[PDB]
Amino acid sequence: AVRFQKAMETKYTKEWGSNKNKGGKITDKKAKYLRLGYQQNPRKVEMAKCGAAITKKRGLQAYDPKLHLAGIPMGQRQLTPYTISGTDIVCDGDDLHFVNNAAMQQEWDDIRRSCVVGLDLAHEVLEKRLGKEVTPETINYYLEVLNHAMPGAAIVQEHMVETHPALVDDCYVKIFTGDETLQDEVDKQFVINIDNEFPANQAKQIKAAVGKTSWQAVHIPTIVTRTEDGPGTSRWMAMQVGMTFISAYHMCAGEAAVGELAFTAKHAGLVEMGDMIPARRARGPNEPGGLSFGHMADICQTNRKGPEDPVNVILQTASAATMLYDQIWLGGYMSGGVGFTMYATPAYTNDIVDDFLYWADEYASKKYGGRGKAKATIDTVKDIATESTLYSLEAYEKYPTTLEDHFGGSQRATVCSIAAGGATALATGHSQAGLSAWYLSMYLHKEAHGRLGFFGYDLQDQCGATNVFSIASDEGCIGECRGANYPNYAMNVGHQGGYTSVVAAAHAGKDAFCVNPLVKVCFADELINFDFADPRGAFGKAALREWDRCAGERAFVIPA
Amino acid sequence: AVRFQKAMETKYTKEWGSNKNKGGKITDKKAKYLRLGYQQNPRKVEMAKCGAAITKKRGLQAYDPKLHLAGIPMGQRQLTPYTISGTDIVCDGDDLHFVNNAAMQQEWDDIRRSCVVGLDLAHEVLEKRLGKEVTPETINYYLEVLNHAMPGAAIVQEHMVETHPALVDDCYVKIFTGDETLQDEVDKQFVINIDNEFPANQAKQIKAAVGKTSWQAVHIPTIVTRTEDGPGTSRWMAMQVGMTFISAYHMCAGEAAVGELAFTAKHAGLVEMGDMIPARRARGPNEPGGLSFGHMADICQTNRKGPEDPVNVILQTASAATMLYDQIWLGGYMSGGVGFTMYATPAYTNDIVDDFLYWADEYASKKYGGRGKAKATIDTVKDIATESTLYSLEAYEKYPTTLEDHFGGSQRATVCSIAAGGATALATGHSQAGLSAWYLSMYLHKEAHGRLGFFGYDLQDQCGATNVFSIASDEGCIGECRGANYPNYAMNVGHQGGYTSVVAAAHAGKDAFCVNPLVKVCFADELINFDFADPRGAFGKAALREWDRCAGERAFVIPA
Amino acid sequence: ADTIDLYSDRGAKLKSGVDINDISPMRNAAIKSIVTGIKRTAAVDLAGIEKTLATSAIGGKGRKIPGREMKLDIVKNAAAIQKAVTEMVQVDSGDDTVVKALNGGKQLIVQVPSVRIDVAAEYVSSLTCTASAVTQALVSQFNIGMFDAPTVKSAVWGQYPQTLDMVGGNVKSIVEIPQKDEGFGYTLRNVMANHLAAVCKKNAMNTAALCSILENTGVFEMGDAIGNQTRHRLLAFSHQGLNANNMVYGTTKALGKTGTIGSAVHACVEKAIADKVISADKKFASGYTTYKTNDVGKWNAYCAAGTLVATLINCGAQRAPQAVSSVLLYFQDLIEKETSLPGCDFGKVQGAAVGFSFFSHSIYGGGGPGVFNGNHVVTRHSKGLAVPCVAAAVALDAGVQVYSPEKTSGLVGDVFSAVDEFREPIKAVAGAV
Amino acid sequence: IEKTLATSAIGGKGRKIPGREMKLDIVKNAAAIQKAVTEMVQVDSGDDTVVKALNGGKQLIVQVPSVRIDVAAEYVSSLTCTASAVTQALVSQFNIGMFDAPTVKSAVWGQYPQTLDMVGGNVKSIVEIPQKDEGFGYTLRNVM
Amino acid sequence: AYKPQYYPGSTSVAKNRRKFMSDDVEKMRDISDEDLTALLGHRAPGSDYPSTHPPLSEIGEPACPVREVVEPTPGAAAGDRMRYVQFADSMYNGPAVPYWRSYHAAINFRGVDPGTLSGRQVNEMRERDMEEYAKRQSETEITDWGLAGMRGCTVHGHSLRLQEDGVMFDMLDRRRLEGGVIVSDKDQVGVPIDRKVNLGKPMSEAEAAKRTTIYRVDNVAFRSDKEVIEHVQRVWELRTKYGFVPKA
């Protein structure tokens, strides 16, 4: 059986809207082209009526499907739906554009608005300079005040303006710690309890990496991150951390020791999601270009909930990461317009990549005597990547409906390489081996079909094989530390979220994290608006306009 | 009379909430400290109740006024209101925080989401490479399609995802031109008509500067600018400009000529609001740090509506600019938390700076034989700055209510220097003379009171006099070209919006723009959500939660 | 060891029996002179300052400051200005400072004395010391009062320091500011292809050479010519950039009437076989034979030369630059299909070319070939073996591009082309061995 | 470098990559590493290259030959040529296989090139990267 | 002279790929010069080629040793605009695949600028030179006008299920079956033209399977071309190895 049977039947053999599709088989090679236009699709009709009303109200042309090139509107072929992979949620592509999907926006806001900041260095400043004694009692008062103050409320001065709590209810600070005594003595409202949130083997591995150190998981207001930018996050955090230390430790409200606390919060103790990127694409920290694939994989939380299905971990990671990197980052920040929804949807719709990756992992796990047991060698990579790619390409050839869904070669290439690279990284526990497989898959794919992706798709592809194991200045880089600013990767769709899934594959079901336990624990928190353990489910609920966890709206301070 | 008489009576001689203030004179030197706490103030009570409900709902401490230092809540002194200057709108400080005031957020979004892009070079590409003939008819079709496509809608391909018009109704493109034939022949829905929007002398001055050139004023969606960042604006613009040229001129959808159009839109023909800033404060283009004071003055539109009151032009400019630079930029992007509302409110509340600047302009205009007739010399600067500063300081000393309103020395210093510098620049038509006066005022102020601003207020102050007329690499700069990244100005509250007002003063009632006619015309458009001709009025309406032009909300795609 | 002969831009033998180590950027005296010369050189637009001031067009990008216009007869007084600038830029009379008027005094070339770059972190003193000297000279020559001096300064320096660069200013170099580098070692790689074609007066061989010298010096600064890479880099540099053994020019001439990209591929394979660089490995049942190499560095260098040959004959046939993107791609793809050996730079020329093709034929960014450079995100990915072909292709344009060197590069091209070693670098490099 | 590799603490700022730990006897082999680095950093025998082990082999001082800064735009060849020489020397000294070489490279160079600087790396100068300059002429001014 | 081998493989697909690379392709149909110009859409049929710059004879050219030895094409000498032809080829055994249209250009024509994508393949040349290339690809077995189309925009179709009549969908309906032959009455960007060009009968499914350069599991499976797979793996392995250390 193929995993995409149901989704292809929904898409092509059942009517959607008034598209008149009915019957047939998902293997059929021919189709009807009814030229119904946009009126076959209720969502497009809603859009068209909204556009005409905007044109009239503002006195300036807005959306009109008749303004397509040649005056021939979309829907000459039938307009067909998508199923969120692993679910029965069926929607239009229009429900999955980042602009139209509040969960997608909130995924990015929740990353952008977050940072991790140590406590140990700050406590050392207090001890060294003032001789203060730091105890669970002083920490608990600090955390109570910090949660009042962090959203933008006063604690020292008088007659002060403050942010309105009704607008900033998504802002808070929790703590996590490898010190088990401190974990138990801090008021539970504030604690991300590693033992509660992670399976025992994962908890042990996290605690070994963090030792006895203690950390703050800080989430600044969504309304602020949207007004400002990613580089604002650590600055916002540090202002209110500084204020709270002043009160909680009876300091002068502005003395030299406060300055050393500022340097602690803003630099020495700070873990940002990523750092700045270069001038041509200038952005500061906590923007998607600076986000390493290891950090993105560690933000995703599926591995702590379902490590027994590492393929699902990989697929959910691919979904959260591909949405961010291709839809919001490349298709938004770095370009815009209609953008790149459908370059990304193969990661999380219609069960096609899922079929291919489950197949390749079954192939490798049987061949190498169990999952994760293959040696990281040229021969292993060659084997898994070749047999995976052949399966995947033959599936597109056996099932015309899948070829038509992934109508752009870039989509097909991404799907194939996720399956080949992910299965190889999972078989070997080795991110580099997975990248090597990704590139071999592309090369096979190009020769099979006499085409690959869009005009510029395989820039990184063709640099790819030779740069996997290069040690050159701007080529050598372990996979977990590559990201959206790795030079070859800095421009093009179809890759960044896929590589994130390959990085995740090297660790899924084996390790608690890929590169940063501090990032991993930060996001292990149900109070975070976006569900990082089940991104597909959040995307789907928001596609239906039913997802209810949006933060940052101005509703409270504007008229109806 | 003093212009602040009414506002000081509202603030202190009339009860606000249940603060029990009643009677007395605005010259009285003593006051009662009733220790009513926060419950005297309905807005604080609303905030407290919201915070308590958040704490309970999420199971994690949120706002509570009792978490002030020492457990002593704000409102030990009475909590008193603000009047928006030039109006009868009375509100709390809390209604003026950028987080809580939708008009303030929209002012920034409308700058961040905007750029200007030439048409002449793009048309030259079409003529040179393809031999196309460009006419008003081809331009009109281009502009119709562009206004459909710019918000994120498809023109060329099939089965495409598009942004939902209901979420992007604030996105559009208009044109302006010095070519009067073209201005007449383009469909009026698209045209910012310079002759209709500006007084005749101003229109002539703009046309002389722009010649016969033609320009697009582009405003990308608010929902997008909030998800992304300033550097996204020109990229979004360029994608949809490129798509529209392909269709409107029957090009290959992706040929070498399209690439030269891309370089045109993204570089050669592009006017951004500002460029990138350095690594320590890393941001790309179209962020506040890169915004020159001349551009901010030219964004403000009061001078085209009321040039007969140049002082009002200066004051409205000070209001828009101070809000952005101190509240959102320095108090947000560069710091955060409670932030810097009250460092900024002296520019737009209680009529105090207004009194001082009207006084100083009356002094100078009488002394020098008419407004704008003083020579730009040391003697003129010394005279106006000294006499203005003495008036302003004496006013704080004669009216204890004003001293208590501007309770921080930084506030007082900003107010005095806006008056002295603004009156000097208006008297001389010279931005450099105005800056020199700003600094002399500060120096007098420090000696008069034996204090100036906060710990770090006068970094730029003390560098100030010597750097006005320096020609050193990173010191020399004509005033109009200084901005939030001029080295001495890169950190501190109380200055950037004030200097913007000084720059405006050198041109108000005299010239149509300060530094960039293209920026000036771009914002001369009532369809832009924020009213750049009356920023005080917009701030005030939004303080009352009555301002109804907010863009970018996600309401349409989330549950009620 | 490795020995080559050096040939001119037109195939005349210049030097015989040259050790490749002697054309290294780390040894060759002319490469040192070219690189350090470029670091020291600035172009001053005196006519530009005069016009900026007369029209108060301070800061560029559409700007005009009403009321701040100033009429200074700068070009008329160019001799006095030149003298004052000389005295301010020099450290000691008789040092290696150069200040010369060009184009009737409308421009100056300035080369700051070497010590201003030696006792300094970077090359920016060429811009800053020049701009300060010019500003001071104008204030003195025209008796400019204190209240007007900032106007003059901003006419010269543009919006700096509000901006990181001298936006709208009138002092410029072919190199961009350090802060625009994509990474370590990219400064000398950040020279626009159009600038290079203008410096070399459209001589495609000299353009390729100047660009190759800068690119390969950059690869050294990146740390990517150390140890097991040094010989590899020098082979490709000499073969692609320095016309080693006349492979580039001689093959271009042989193929210049009827040759295609494919002809250039075939010529490269044929020559590698004849010269014993590659040989038959495994014969498949169809008759197709894979090839093996005994010298990766040499095979790679032959591919680098062949890639430039293909550019010269294909873009030369079009008398236009745009096809260089596709030449760089398809030379490699075809030679790999023909031999089963990796193409130039092991895929990295091909990959750069894929993205370059896209970003020169699409909506998303880039532009024509002339806007690219070794620091451009699109074209950086080869270790010096792609952009020299781009610059050569620009030189071959007969008038197709809109954003040509005439549009983008007039000031710096006029100034930098005055320097013989920059304009004629092949001759210079061979003269130093 | 030795500690970074042994703990797979690649890239700094809290990072650890499970499964990529490598145990190399670097400090105890400092003399052999110094000799290999010297031959790679030098251009010509007898030039002004310096490479010396300090503090019991825990550190090297490297001074690249002058030509690497003279025929160069900036000063960064001191960092990059050193980092490349050290990476190559470790791979050869410890017979590191291709699949493990990126681990060694990232232990030396940190997160570069994902980051602009060698974050979490082990080759440093008192001067910061040129891209961090506030303006023209600031590189020599950027020393803590 | 060196005799190229072009590409590995013994399958029909590999043989057909070598035919494309060597321009050893069968002429299938006649298309007049004016009909081709009408389909391309860049100038009126029969009209003079517009120029973007003056002819080389009028303005001469800078001193350059390369210009002295590289002959301009006729279109370059005349100053023609750079114009293009663009094709979309069905994955259901369309004779051409994108990369092989580009190899055909690069091997067999001087002065080409080919671009390969999944759903479109393009070549920009000086206009008169471009027409010679377009004619060769349009008249030979490189193109089947049922399974392929000339599409400068709105290219959607290569990966879609074929119409019931066996023709690849065109959103803009530039060409279609009429009376058993393909006819076309629009230019390549969808502008109606005042003629109807006869582009011949489409190939049968059986002839397409024999002539195609695409592998498909239900025709000639890629899995079965062991030589091509071995070639791909060898190039991958050597690129990988040489990227670590550039040594044989």
Ligand code: F43
């Ligand atoms: C004008 C270009 C050249 C360019 O720079 N970008 C374009 C167009 C652009 C527009 C199309 C919007 C519209 O329809 O008006 C947008 C959405 C970017 C934007 N401006 O917002 C886009 N492409 Ni394109 N583009 C796509 C794709 C593709 C595929 C489509 C092949 C097909 O058979 O239809 C091909 C490349 C290829 O052949 O591999 C392609 C080409 C092209 N792409 C050709 C137009 C093709 C045509 O004439 O029909 N895109 C894809 O392969 C899938 C994803 C899809 C993107 C939309 C999304 O992700 O939601 C879109 C991404």
Ligand SMILES: C[C@@H](OP(=O)(O)O)[C@H](NC(=O)CCCCCCS)C(=O)O
């Ligand atoms: C190349 C470069 O553009 P410029 O050549 O600098 O205009 C760059 N754009 C991009 O990389 C666009 C990436 C997203 C769109 C294409 C995705 S395949 C940028 O805007 O900084």
Ligand SMILES: O=S(=O)(O)CCS
């Ligand atoms: O057609 S292009 O590959 O340039 C762009 C695809 S979205």
Ligand SMILES: O=S(=O)(O)CCS
């Ligand atoms: O007290 S300080 O001047 O340091 C800060 C004022 S907000």
Ligand SMILES: [K+]
């Ligand atoms: K001197």
Ligand SMILES: [K+]
């Ligand atoms: K050496």
Ligand code: NA
């Ligand atoms: Na934002």
